[PDB]
């Protein structure tokens, strides 16, 4: 059997994780070091223990391999472009073996790496062959790197979860699992593949994974190590996991496997999958319910006031019928024919046979749609960077109606105006952009110095950026010499550094007109600042424009079978904006709108030059243009020469380039979406659609209503003459007049109408959101780099991003929670070996994952699986566990450990901090608060870290216009106030002196932190484990006074048999409860949620919720009005603008969540997709005057006190794993005015 | 108002062309076609 085949430590853990033994730190530690010590290939032996009955037979043609030498030609001078076999797009990877080009690594024999000799040739002398070999090894060991860890390890956790059956929890609606590991086609095809890699009884994995990349095993003579098998195992593992967290039927699962075995067998594994990526949502999600007899329940959502403030409201239940079926035809004819060419038709007829057995909209039907959509291979697809640029970036759009050259005026310097005669879609684009440019040019908003410092903060990216080259190898065109390091400089050309390099003349200088030399360097801060009036106008078109309340509510309303919905996705909206049509009308219109401004007004540091103006043939005359028009003359000299790309990929060896194209990797190809559809519904489609009925429908349709634009995506929802839509006459003739409308100016519209709704990759069928589990797979994670970046505790943040991202999805939790726990444990045994010294290690105890968000399986006093996966992370969850069993550990430590002599007011004389320290709670509490990334070493050239000149002069870019005085008035008037009078913080309130330090902390975050720093991380980590402070935190020790007891479940928010979310059916215990007790559509009252944050305009270096808390955190205390203006001057706001905020910030009319933010009680990301708005302020009492005690009566202080107490209640109410229920503060240990005073001691810090 | 008062005042020769030039163009074009013009008399604003 599988269970008695495992190692002693693992058998105990599998038992422990399953629920039989609450796991202790000894169970956790021995199971952690059992993984890292034993060889990784040994967990493939466990496949040989389970018997198998699935009829999946792998072909012997998997291991055949067309060699890489035919499929990796250096067509250009140093470009390893793969010569496609049969296509332009067959370039993902070749299904070759790396048999010859491997030399055995001496540490792990029979596991080789790139040949030492071959690598040298590529670096020194190109070997059309000696570099084509190197670009094949660094792709196949990078395509086998798109994975969270070793996938052989991720399979090893699934055998732990399937080692034992789960202990029955005791809940009524707890279904034991139906999945049998002896009946699974995924991990039977793994073992059938793994027979080929067998040298005398032992298994060799074909590619052990190292943070530099994969290490491929060297086959003995006669066998081939084909690179596709490692990806064929990475998908088959990811199917073996997604069919044990989904309860996928064995027959349905079998079809998915045959999809993979055909793909490994053909020439390219990666390529085959891509051509059949949409072959599985089309069979099921797109085509559900077309048979007669359709009819279940579906929600009845309303659009309240449609024009703006999309505020959908869940109002009722519809009863479906044979009418309002999906009018669109099924995808069986089209996808199956496409499917037919790869010889899997039989896997198409199986899924069609299953789908015809779900005729009506049930829980079982919409669970089936998630089962088929979890069959698409969610692995990422690495392609050579040089090769990728050729096939993606450079595709010039085809225009079926160009602007004639006699439709422009004469030139005015560089740009041209459009003539008034030429109507069409070009005229509406010109008129909607010129009218918006003549609103921006007459505006007081962008002349304020704080708005300038915000705009300079958007250019140096606080998040993102790319590998820009430099500036002074591009300023040899100019005369301006750039700044150099005063002291040793660490940051290399960081977007921030570019600002640092030239900050002498407001981050730009009309002496710096050499911004057009080498742009967009990616595999510029002065081109982002030349493009100021291009995204200033695009942020006026995008006035009407989050996912949780502006998309999730929508997708649902659009999917209901009243209104039929066309979803419009534009393919390559980047590569459709060209200067031949789109970007010349834009720069033409902005230069026309920018004349209603004062024609001598400089903008953003660019003066007001003159221009030729030759647009009249009888009188050309020099004309002074404005400052904003001067940027347009340099935008038109930049957009017309395209964008340079200095792509130099590290995958291919010598591949360096200089690439010009017309694609930008900001919000304009978002902004052009609405105005080009506004012309469709009003002018173009009523002009010709050849249908009397069709024309009638369009006339009553606008674009503010009936269209929701975002990015390149968008949903077009028709007027209410809806379900009654003739698909032959109306909805297909509306589509061909749409798809030919976009082709007359290059926009390749890709319409795919069906009665689901796709909106930025969140599908929903019939009022029920369907999560795509292959969008973020369990084993898969992109990296997009040769060498990765994994020190050691950067695996823990992956695990919490692996667990919580699977629970936004309605993945079954019990199979999932156990899997997450097993995976979490592996991520607790780490190490670091010095290059010239001793090796090191660390051991995170469990309870360091309970503090991070993973709920525990079995505490020592309970029954397993009663802590829900919606438990909030941190102190809200550490309270909501300790509030659960405080009646247990007090009774247990009264009959074990001796009583303490003094009294802890939360407990009694029963001594539980010496019991909590025995269970390892404090060692888990102080471990996760300890930092995880290695600190950049504190090394400078001079002044003991002071007088740094790259940090002190990034402030010069942020201090233009005597704003510098306001942040100096802020840090003076606050330090005069706080450190001597009262409210003495000791640390800085979030002022503007932190963010030039924050650009360096996000800039000096260099790779390879030296061995001096990561050893210092390992030593500091080991001290906070061995001597974790016995005392808890200062917030948690005050939260534990509250005794929260919860009553019977609250009146429901959804008739709990309409299925709202992809399988949160009674197979799932709590996910069906928390999605029907609470509702979806998370729009609530304006006294709870309504997105205030009473500052709004942050400087982008500051957290918005750090200002919003500390503006409230003073108002809780006895703050003088001076302490509000001194903090708000620290952000840089003017004294007049700070005063209007200093009077506003009252607890009366303050969002309930904001008050909770003061003491760091946040609504977490786990239930952001839930309607916890009315739950907190209706139910979850802070005082129910008959159950509660009069001792816990927050009297006068209740305005700010109640929010905290209502969020401690709902933290306990979502942590337990049943229906949500009314949670009452029973009593507080010590009175509530003796706790409200206790928080105000902490709120002075 | 400002749109239609442009369409009222835009000069156009086809009001002139229909009263003056097209009758001497129609009467020539009715003697060079193999089908002679078949006309019933136009009646304007007369019910009976």
């Amino acid at each position: 059997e599988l269970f008695n085949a495992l190692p002693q430590p693992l058998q105990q853990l599998s038992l422990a994780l399953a629920g039989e033994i609450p796991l202790t730190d000894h169970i956790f530690e021995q199971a952690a070091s059992t993984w890292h010590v034993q060889p990784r290939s040994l967990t493939y032996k466990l496949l040989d223990h389970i018997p198998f009955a699935t009829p999946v037979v792998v072909p012997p043609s998997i291991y055949h391999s067309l060699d890489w030498s035919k499929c990796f030609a250096v067509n250009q001078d140093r470009v390893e472009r793969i010569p496609t076999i049969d296509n332009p797009d067959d370039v993902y990877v070749p299904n070759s073996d790396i048999g010859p080009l491997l030399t055995s690594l001496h540490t792990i024999p029979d596991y080789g790496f790139l040949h030492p000799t071959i690598e040298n040739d590529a670096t020194t002398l190109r070997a059309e062959r000696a570099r084509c070999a190197s670009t094949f090894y660094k792709i196949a060991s990078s395509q086998a790197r798109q994975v969270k860890l070793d996938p052989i390890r991720m399979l090893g956790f699934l055998l732990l979860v399937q080692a034992r059956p789960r202990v029955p929890s005791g809940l009524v609606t707890d279904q034991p699992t139906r999945r049998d590991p002896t009946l699974s086609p995924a991990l039977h095809a793994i073992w059938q593949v793994m027979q080929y890699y067998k040298v005398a009884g032992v298994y060799y994995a074909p590619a052990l994974v190292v943070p530099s990349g994969a290490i491929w095993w060297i086959p003995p003579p006669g066998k081939r190590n084909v690179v596709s098998v490692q990806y064929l195992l990475t998908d088959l593992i990811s199917l073996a996991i997604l069919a044990h967290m989904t309860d996928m039927s064995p027959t349905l699962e079998l079809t998915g496997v045959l999809m993979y075995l055909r793909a490994a067998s053909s020439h390219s594994y990666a390529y085959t999958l891509l051509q059949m990526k949409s072959v599985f949502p089309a069979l099921s999600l797109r085509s559900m319910y077309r048979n007669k007899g359709f009819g279940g329940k579906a929600p009845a959502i309303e659009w309240t006031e449609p024009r703006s403030k999309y505020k959908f409201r869940w109002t009722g239940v519809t009863q479906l019928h044979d009418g309002l079926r999906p009018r669109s035809p099924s995808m069986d004819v089209p996808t199956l024919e496409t499917l037919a060419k790869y010889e899997l038709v039989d896997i198409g007829h199986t899924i069609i046979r299953e789908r015809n057995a779900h005729p009506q909209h049930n829980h079982d039907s919409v669970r089936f749609v998630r089962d088929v959509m979890a069959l698409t291979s969610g692995m990422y697809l690495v392609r050579q960077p040089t090769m990728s640029v050729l096939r993606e970036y450079s595709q010039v759009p085809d225009i079926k109606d160009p602007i004639p050259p006699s439709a422009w005026t004469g030139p005015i310097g560089n740009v041209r105006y459009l003539l008034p005669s030429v109507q069409g879609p070009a005229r509406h684009l010109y008129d909607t952009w010129r009218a918006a440019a003549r609103q921006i040019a007459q505006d007081p908003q962008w002349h304020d110095p704080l708005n300038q410092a915000i705009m300079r903060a958007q250019y140096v990216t606080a998040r993102g950026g790319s590998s820009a080259s430099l500036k002074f190898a591009l300023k040899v065109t100019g005369i301006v010499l750039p700044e150099y390091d005063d002291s040793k400089v660490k940051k290399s050309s960081k977007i921030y550094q570019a600002a640092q390099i030239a900050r002498i003349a407001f981050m730009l200088l009309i002496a710096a007109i050499h911004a057009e030399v080498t742009m967009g360097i990616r595999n510029n801060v002065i081109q982002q600042a030349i493009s100021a009036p291009h995204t200033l106008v695009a942020n006026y078109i995008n006035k009407h424009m989050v996912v949780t309340d502006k998309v999730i509510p929508l997708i649902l309303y659009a999917s209901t079978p009243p209104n039929t919905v066309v979803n419009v996705d534009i393919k390559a909206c980047d590569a459709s904006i060209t200067y031949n049509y789109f970007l010349s009308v834009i720069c033409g219109a902005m230069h026309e709108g920018f004349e209603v401004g004062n024609a001598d007004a400089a903008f953003m540091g660019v003066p007001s030059t003159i221009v030729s103006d030759r647009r009249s043939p009888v009188a050309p005359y020099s004309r002074p243009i404005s400052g904003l028009q001067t940027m347009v003359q340099h935008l038109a000299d930049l957009y017309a020469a395209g964008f340079r790309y200095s792509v130099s990929d590290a995958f291919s060896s010598g591949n360096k380039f200089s690439f010009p194209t017309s694609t930008f990797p900001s919000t304009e190809h978002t902004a052009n979406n609405s105005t080009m559809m506004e012309y469709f519904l009003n002018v173009h489609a009523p002009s010709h659609v050849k249908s009397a009925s069709l024309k009638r429908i369009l006339t009553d349709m606008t674009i503010q209503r009936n269209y929701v634009c975002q990015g390149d995506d968008g949903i077009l929802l028709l007027p209410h003459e809806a379900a009654s839509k003739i698909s032959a006459d109306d909805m297909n003739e509306l589509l061909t007049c749409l798809r030919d409308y976009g082709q007359l100016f290059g926009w390749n519209y890709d319409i795919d109408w069906s009665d689901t709704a796709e909106y930025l990759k969140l599908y929903a069928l019939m009022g029920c959101r369907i999560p795509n589990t292959s969008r973020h797979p369990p084993v898969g994670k992109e990296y997009a780099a040769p060498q990765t970046d994994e020190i050691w505790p950067s695996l823990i943040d992956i695990v919490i991003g692996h667990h919580l991202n699977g629970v936004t999805d309605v993945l079954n939790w019990r199979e999932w929670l156990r899997f997450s726990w097993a995976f979490a444990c592996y991520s607790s045994r780490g190490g670091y070996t010095n290059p010239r010294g001793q090796s090191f290690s660390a051991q995170y105890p469990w309870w360091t994952f309970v503090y991070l968000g993973i709920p525990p399986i079995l505490l020592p006093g309970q029954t397993p699986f009663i802590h829900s996966c919606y438990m909030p992370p941190g102190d809200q969850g550490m309270f909501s566990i300790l509030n659960g069993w405080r009646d247990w550990l007090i009774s247990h430590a009264s009959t074990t450990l001796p009583p303490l002599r003094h009294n802890h007011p939360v407990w009694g004389l029963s001594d539980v901090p010496s019991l909590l320290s025995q269970f390892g709670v404090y060692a888990g509490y102080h471990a996760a608060q300890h930092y995880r990334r290695p600190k950049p070493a504190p090394e400078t050239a001079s002044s003991d870290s002071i007088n740094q000149i790259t940090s002190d002069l990034t402030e010069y870019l942020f201090y233009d216009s005597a704003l510098k005085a306001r942040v100096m008035k802020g840090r003076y008037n606050w330090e005069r106030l706080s450190s001597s009078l009262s409210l003495n913080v000791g640390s800085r309130v979030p002022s503007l002196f932190d963010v030039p330090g924050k650009w360096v902390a996000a800039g000096r975050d260099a790779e390879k932190p030296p061995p001096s720093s990561v050893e210092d991380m390992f030593t500091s980590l080991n001290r906070c484990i061995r001597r974790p402070t016995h005392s808890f935190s200062r917030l948690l020790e005050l939260y534990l006074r509250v005794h929260v007891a919860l009553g019977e479940s609250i009146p429901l928010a959804i008739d709990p048999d309409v299925p709202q979310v992809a399988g949160a059916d009674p197979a799932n215990d709590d996910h069906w409860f928390k999605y029907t007790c609470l509702g979806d559509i998370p729009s609530a009252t304006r006294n709870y949620f309504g997105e205030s944050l009473f500052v709004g305009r942050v400087v982008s270096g500051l957290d918005v919720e750090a200002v919003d808390a500390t503006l409230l955190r003073l108002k809780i205390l006895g703050a003088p009005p001076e302490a509000f203006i001194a903090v708000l001057n620290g952000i840089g706001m003017s004294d007049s603008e700070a005063h209007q905020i200093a009077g506003r910030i009252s607890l009366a009319n303050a969002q309930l969540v904001q008050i909770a933010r003061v003491v760091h009680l946040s609504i977490p990301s786990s239930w952001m997709t839930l309607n916890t708005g009315p739950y907190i302020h209706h139910h979850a009492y802070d005082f129910k005057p008959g159950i509660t005690q009069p001792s816990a009566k927050s009297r006068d202080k209740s305005i700010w006190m109640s929010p905290i107490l209502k969020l401690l209640c709902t933290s306990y109410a979502m942590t337990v794993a049943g229906p949500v229920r009314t949670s009452i503060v029973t009593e507080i240990d010590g009175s509530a005015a003796a706790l409200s005073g206790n928080l105000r001691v902490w709120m002075r810090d | 108002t400002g749109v239609m008062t442009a369409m009222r005042q835009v000069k156009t020769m086809t009001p002139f062309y229909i009263q003056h030039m097209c009758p001497t163009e129609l009467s020539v074009l009715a003697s060079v076609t193999v089908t002679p013009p078949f006309q019933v008399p136009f009646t304007r604003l007369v019910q009976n």
Partner: peptide
């Protein structure tokens, strides 16, 4: 000669015609 460039210049400051030659030939 029919050409809307007289009309479109005047009407866009405030923002083969076979159906004309058929209703003349129908007279």
């Amino acid at each position: 000669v029919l050409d809307p460039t007289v009309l479109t210049n005047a009407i866009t400051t405030i923002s083969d015609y076979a159906a004309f030659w058929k209703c003349i030939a129908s007279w």
